[PDB]
Write a protein that binds this DNA or RNA. Structure first.
Length: 65
DNA sequence: GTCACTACCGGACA
DNA sequence: GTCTGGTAGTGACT
């Protein structure tokens, strides 16, 4: 839940230059897409935030041999 | 206006 | 992938 299923969140802290100490946070989607901002992720979620399930996504069988 | 702070995004790197 | 700086937006205010 806190990080949506299959997504990854990265937090990093800058160590040098004028912005030393500032944090950067970005997310990686289940497909490997990297979002460095809430704006860009929000825009993407408009059309691509839905996930769907089919019966074929669930394997009810045990293989032989 | 300044100031402090947040947020987005491009680009340098070899 | 790693790493940040420039720009812009918000809002309180001696």
């Amino acid at each position: 839940k806190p990080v949506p299923c299959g997504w990854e969140r990265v937090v990093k802290q800058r160590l040098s230059g004028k912005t030393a100490g500032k944090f950067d946070v970005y997310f990686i989607s289940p497909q490997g897409l990297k979002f460095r901002s809430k704006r860009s992720l929000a825009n993407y979620l408009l059309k691509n935030g839905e996930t769907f399930l089919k019966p074929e996504d669930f394997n009810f069988t045990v293989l032989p041999k």
